[PDB]
């Protein structure tokens, strides 16, 4: 994949990482630094490769002073299978690192006391990054299950609540057990900041999802599930009852006895074409 | 046990909310494709200009109205400006889009004030 | 005895006097509500524009006048400008208000010279 | 809801504080930096919260190298109760801060030596921030006490005289008695600068107060106190003898004889709208 | 002098000085820092005032991390008396600082162990800055004597040679006696860099001097000294025999017997008007 | 003795060689005075443009000639451009001065090559 | 006079070296930083001086985080003696450096322990910079040795083969035998990168050499060595069999019979000026 | 035994291949010396312009030709362009040389295609 090579060629680095490397060079902690850099770099390259395969919109691979990120540009507009396969490509890749390390140690290329450090760091990083807090990698795995079981908005809110509860639990645990170990405090602050920034844009996320659902290109068409809704609610309040990766025919109820059956196409056309934002749905049966 | 040294490092994928603004050559290609007729190109053109809607909504604060309806009206204004855009005048697309956003918000605000 | 280890520090509330200038969106809304009827919009418009008189009066300094009358008539001229604004001519409110207040102070100076 | 988050997006940090903290971390001054920062931050968040609740126009929560400051844009505008509630919110958080510190130290989370330093700093800051010097917190309470008894202009002159006398006494003490104490020279210079800047702007406050008084639309009318005036002084001297939150009917004295009462609204209307200034009340008694 | 106040109002400070002050604040060396800052600030203000009095072209008063400078914009184009009076205004001013310190110590405003430190620092700074090395203040005092005794170019070159010799002597002394004390090394490298930068622009300095000598405004017209020159040398080579603050009539010699007497006016007009740069002088008697 | 603590601080006056470039209003005043006739204004105008002479001289290196004659010829070119400047064309003074210096240097170089 | 100052105005410093030095100063590594910097600076100043003396086109004296580099713009251009003199100037300064260090230590200016470290670093750097790997200094000496026995193209191919073999052996050793040694991985990677970049540009060097040969105007004509050619190969194969600093008369062989000698200047004239390329010498034997 | 305390370091001379482009002053001087007669000026002019053919040859890649012929024909075209320069037409030497070399390579390609 040529695009993969182009992505590898233009990896950016934060300035503080150079200072950390210089400090570690003049003290003698270079082996651990190289181990951590290699682990993080491969973990991120797996995500980058599986994102390029599906032809997403990757912008930049980054190396923070406390890890690395891949800055993709897709939020809530892709099928569930792709957003699961891209996420799972990270943790499912430490296995071959472990196997290669074991083989190299057995051949006696590297000493015994080096093989232990690599295994410890590898397993520790995997277990830490498997935690169920947004964004990490457990939160983005629980959110998919929630969205498969619940509509988009309710799943989003429940994810936010559970992530916040777990973040406070982790903070309390850190405070009572180990006030030291700066890395824990940095991780906690990063989690809190990221949670706040994500919570600040729920409406824009929902808007992106709805506009994606409008120009649907019929990606591997799915089943149809009808909705029992009365003709007394707002159209925006019923638009918030759409399930990801499914089709939702509308059943209109008027005074106990249903009137007719409506599809997503005409209501979506009315909302994004007739300038009727939040008027009503009682006249959607006969618009004009 | 070994809790004294863990080094909590992070590795994840970051989902941007608003994609960064797009260049000129492929945006002209996008408009030509839209003139030919394609929904996907229209979708990309619309979603690459949500930053303008964000700024217009945030600077229209200090009024008390909630943000959901303002965001919806801004999106409607942006889609109306993109669909009805005319390249014959000789101006940048972003300015026309922002002006359409402002006009649509003022038009809805007048009706809201008349109603209440 | 306890001194040399105090560290005094401070915490206050710092009531400003001149509000920051309005952005390019609130002025049109305030003018529209004033047209449909709102005295609070007039109050905000005449309060957010008190920065200009501060330099206007000081520019008419070193001439032998107490600042009280100057500032009072400057606010009077600001009311003149706000009440009789015609924004359709294609100009900024700031220059109209500055012209009106300087004309008002010049009228006061001419009247004082004639009386004296 | 959303107003508190908007407030959270207003905090700013001075560039010199970053250098102060960075140098303090390395030298070993870490058990005091957190205490000072936390105390200042809570003492200012109290002001910010009870200013946001009453619908005031906040601008920043700027944090300075020698303390913290919150900036509003309401000078001589809001009623007495609002300002009293906003001001008193400062020297109140220290009670629950001390209670929480004692509770946290009773279950042995913080060592006994740490508890002494925190309570020392807490009491020191609380007692320093109560001095009767403008602006601080004691000066504003004294200003409220003067305003609730005296006309506004006299209450703004006497406060500025008293604060100047107190600041001069403090400056003499700190310069000619105590050895050095670099942390007090900053306080003295800042107090002098703020007092001079506030003295230089004594007329804009008065005109803002008059404009606010004129534009009240039945803003909870209250205690009525008629006043008497003579034929000598103009309308300006009559306007200066006004009190905060009171309506003052005016008696027109025609050289010993009294005609009738004079409404305040008509006087303000003649002063501002009718353009009828630079005249005595005799002209007002016979208008167009 | 209003311009003096304007100069004081806009003093610039190098960023590293803030870091030095922050480091001193957190360690406890503030008294010495204030003493040194006060001494340097007053020493530079004296230069600034005496430069403003003569109406020179001051640009900016600067505070380096190792002292302060005044960036005047006049080089080799002013009468000797002004360039002596401006220089001498610095060292002739520590006297009143010493007297005020002695009086304050006698009144018992400051303790005994503080009065000694100020005197030591004051005398040490004066003696250090009195050294005869360009630029400092001894070099700019020796250069005036050299220019009064020798022509401009020869004096400039001799000054450069003597300054370089003294700089190498000081460097050797520092190396053999005290390799430590970073301040000495900083001063040495600053002297070397400044000497190199000044040596790089001798031709431009001479050009400025000649251009000033052309449009002479007759500043206190002085004596006249004739020059015995033969009509066989280049005009640029005889132009390099002009003495500062003097008039030099030219005597032209042709084969043992002099031809006539020439003044600076006609030869300078020929050089800067007739485009004749470096042709000859034998035809200057009858140009055209 | 007490040599261990001295703190070698410096305090001096710095003489700039080339004064920094001048603004527009007082340079127009300088040209007006020169048109009226004054040697001092001409001197200031000449000495404020030695930076150009410096750059064009230094970029003409890689030729083997010494710097004294090149500096003198650059100064002659600058003074000729200043004296013969015409404001009617409508161009910036600095560009005209630089072009005059370049022409003078090229002419002298051609003459030297012919006379070599 | 002035060329040396112009050279001094060419030194540049990499940004990472500033951070390296700043962190080294604080940690306590100061007795080695000065030694390394001084040794590298003198080792490069030797090259710079004997390159400036022979009138070469220097560009920088860039100082890298892992050593130093000087950049010229003369590849296969100057004669053999010039390049030999420039190259040999490097591994010569160490002799007088060691002599001066021993003299300075005999009179007890530097302690005995300091003397050991300096001579250790001196000998280590001198012996490392003599390895037969391009570019270093051993590789260039080997290339000079090859160029005096073999044609230029063969001397540029065999050197590239030998340096590649040596670099591969060194890389195998340093990766699979020695534990870590972070200071050698940088050397190996830099050597590999430089060798690859040199291999990628093997034709521009040849064309520059041919252009330089054609534009020699009696540039100290030297040893004459006639050559013989056959009717099979074109003129390109004839041009490839040229040696540095030698003029080669060519014998035209008409299938066994020899006509006469062929001048080199006319061959180059037909190749470049007459544009008579893409032809064999049979066409050259019968030109226009 | 002595290893782990070596610090290797390096010092070399790094012979560049393409000289840096000439500034806006030396090209005119070299052209004038060539006009009055100097082959060294021609050598410098043809040596300071190798980057052009360096990118041109790679731009004509993926077509099935060896690099030696392409670089030789590019150098020949560069000689063509530099020899017959007429700078009075108001253009840069770089674009003229690029046009000449690309045209000469096109001529070579057409000849090869006709022969094949
Ligand atoms: C353009 C010029 C550039 C110059 C750069 C700055 C030069 C600064 C030199 C820094 C440096 C090499 C760094 C090379 C990196 C360069 C590669 C660049 C790549 C760029 C990406 C030289 O350090 C030397 O400096 C000498 C002077 O102090 C000292 O040796 C003298 O010997 C006596 C004999 O006589 C003298 O008597 C006496 O005075 C000195 O004892 C030692 O400090 C040391 O030998 C640091 O060395 C490092 O080695 C490693 C062990 O491999 C050490 O690791 C740790 O050691 C234990 C202690 O924690 C730990 O327990 C252990 O866990 C860990 O193993 C480090 O600690 C560190 O020592
Ligand atoms: C994008 C990549 C990002 C990579 C970041 C840097 C990664 C580099 C890791 C650096 C680091 C972890 C600390 C991380 C904190 C920074 C968190 C980053 C947040 C950024 C905001 C190495 O930690 C490991 O390094 C290994 C090196 O060999 C060693 O393991 C060994 O290997 C094998 C040998 O036999 C064995 O098999 C294995 O059993 C061994 O254990 C151990 O040192 C350790 O395991 C630093 O070590 C830390 O531990 C101790 C000293 O040890 C220090 O305590 C100090 O002690 C006092 C005496 O001085 C000080 O007075 C005091 O001050 C402080 O109490 C700490 O202060 C810190 O120095
Ligand atoms: C928006 C928030 C801003 C917060 C800023 C950062 C806050 C950092 C605080 C820094 C700071 C005050 C600095 C105030 C400046 C602020 C004014 C701003 C002006 C801006 C322009 C507080 O330092 C306190 O910190 C405490 C915690 O460590 C320690 O006291 C605790 O008490 C126990 C009781 O229980 C605890 O048990 C125990 O744990 C601690 O011992 C002490 O360090 C100290 O009391 C440093 O104090 C300084 O005092 C001076 C003596 O006047 C000292 O001078 C020197 O002392 C000798 C030792 O060298 C020297 O020999 C001598 O030569 C020299 O006299 C300094 O040394 C330094 O100490
Ligand atoms: C634009 C203004 C610029 C101002 C610049 C800063 C000016 C501030 C001066 C700061 C400074 C001079 C050093 C200057 C070096 C920086 C040169 C600047 C070049 C910039 C590139 C103060 O020096 C004076 O400060 C006075 C404060 O009171 C004290 O005087 C007393 O006052 C009265 C009391 O009774 C009495 O009457 C009087 O008799 C006393 O003497 C003394 O400290 C001293 O006289 C720093 O002190 C220095 O000395 C000693 C510790 O003393 C330190 O040695 C360390 O010791 C080890 C144990 O830790 C360390 O392990 C080790 O590391 C190091 O060996 C030094 O390292 C440094 O700390
Ligand atoms: C115009 C500028 C003034 C120039 C001269 C003033 C300074 C002279 C030297 C004094 C020491 C330097 C102070 C640095 C800080 C320090 O070192 O300590 C600072 C000392 C601490 O005193 P202490 O802790 O030792 O004892 C403490 C025992 N109570 O308090 C000071 O001094 C403050 C400065 C004096 C206050 C008055 C300000 C100046 C008024 C005018 C001065 C007189 C003018 C001429 C009168 C005829
Ligand atoms: C694709 C990327 C490779 C992924 C897997 C490679 C790394 C696995 C873990 C090894 C430890 C991490 C090294 C960090 C530095 C360190 O820790 O030490 C570094 C150790 C030091 O050895 P020593 O000092 O302990 O003893 C020294 C006793 N002589 O030298 C190394 O190892 C160098 C790396 C191995 C060299 C080969 C490079 C990779 C080739 C392909 C690997 C095999 C591919 C699969 C084969 C089927």
Author numbering:
A (entry chain A), D (entry chain C), E (entry chain E), G (entry chain G): 1 to 288
B (entry chain B), C (entry chain D), F (entry chain F), H (entry chain H): 11 to 126
Paper text:
S2P intramembrane metalloproteases regulate diverse signaling pathways across all three domains of life. Here we determine the cryo-EM structure of the S2P family intramembrane metalloprotease SpoIVFB from Bacillus subtilis bound to its native substrate Pro-σK. The structure and accompanying biochemical data demonstrate that SpoIVFB positions Pro-σK at the enzyme active site through a β-sheet augmentation mechanism, and reveal key interactions between Pro-σK and the interdomain linker connecting SpoIVFB transmembrane and CBS domains. Finally, the zinc-metalloprotease activity of SpoIVFB results in cleavage of the N-terminal pro-sequence of Pro-σK within the interior of the lipid membrane, allowing the mature σK to diffuse from the outer forespore membrane into the mother cell cytoplasm, bind to RNA polymerase core subunits, and initiate transcription of genes involved in the final stages of B. subtilis spore maturation (step 3).
Thus, although WT SpoIVFB appears to display robust enzymatic activity in E. coli, this activity is lost after detergent solubilization and purification of WT SpoIVFB and Pro-σK. To further investigate the overall architecture of detergent-solubilized SpoIVFB and Pro-σK preparations, we pursued cryo-EM reconstructions of both WT and E44Q SpoIVFB co-purified with Pro-σK. In total, the physical interaction between monomers in the WT SpoIVFB:Pro-σK tetramer is quite limited (~488Å2 for interface 1, ~510Å2 for interface 2), which likely makes for fragile interactions between SpoIVFB:Pro-σK monomers that are largely mediated by lipid/detergent. As elaborated on below and in the discussion, we believe that the oligomeric arrangement of SpoIVFB:Pro-σK monomers in the tetramer is likely an artifact of detergent solubilization, rather than a representation of an oligomeric state that is sampled in vivo. Aside from the difference in oligomeric state, which we believe arises simply from variations between protein preparations and fragile monomer interfaces, the final structures of WT and E44Q SpoIVFB:Pro-σK monomers are virtually superimposable (RMSD ~ 0.5 Å). For this reason, we refer to WT SpoIVFB:Pro-σK in the following presentation of results due to the slightly higher overall resolution obtained for this complex. While the orientation of zinc-coordinating residues H43, H47, and D137 of SpoIVFB are conserved with those of mjS2P, the cryo-EM map of WT SpoIVFB:Pro-σK does not show any appreciable density for an ion being coordinated by these residues. This lack of density was consistent in the cryo-EM maps of both WT and E44Q SpoIVFB:Pro-σK, demonstrating that SpoIVFB:Pro-σK complexes fail to co-purify with the Zn2+ ion that is essential for supporting Pro-σK cleavage. Thus, the cryo-EM maps provide an explanation for why WT SpoIVFB consistently co-purifies with full-length unprocessed Pro-σK despite displaying robust proteolytic activity in E. coli.
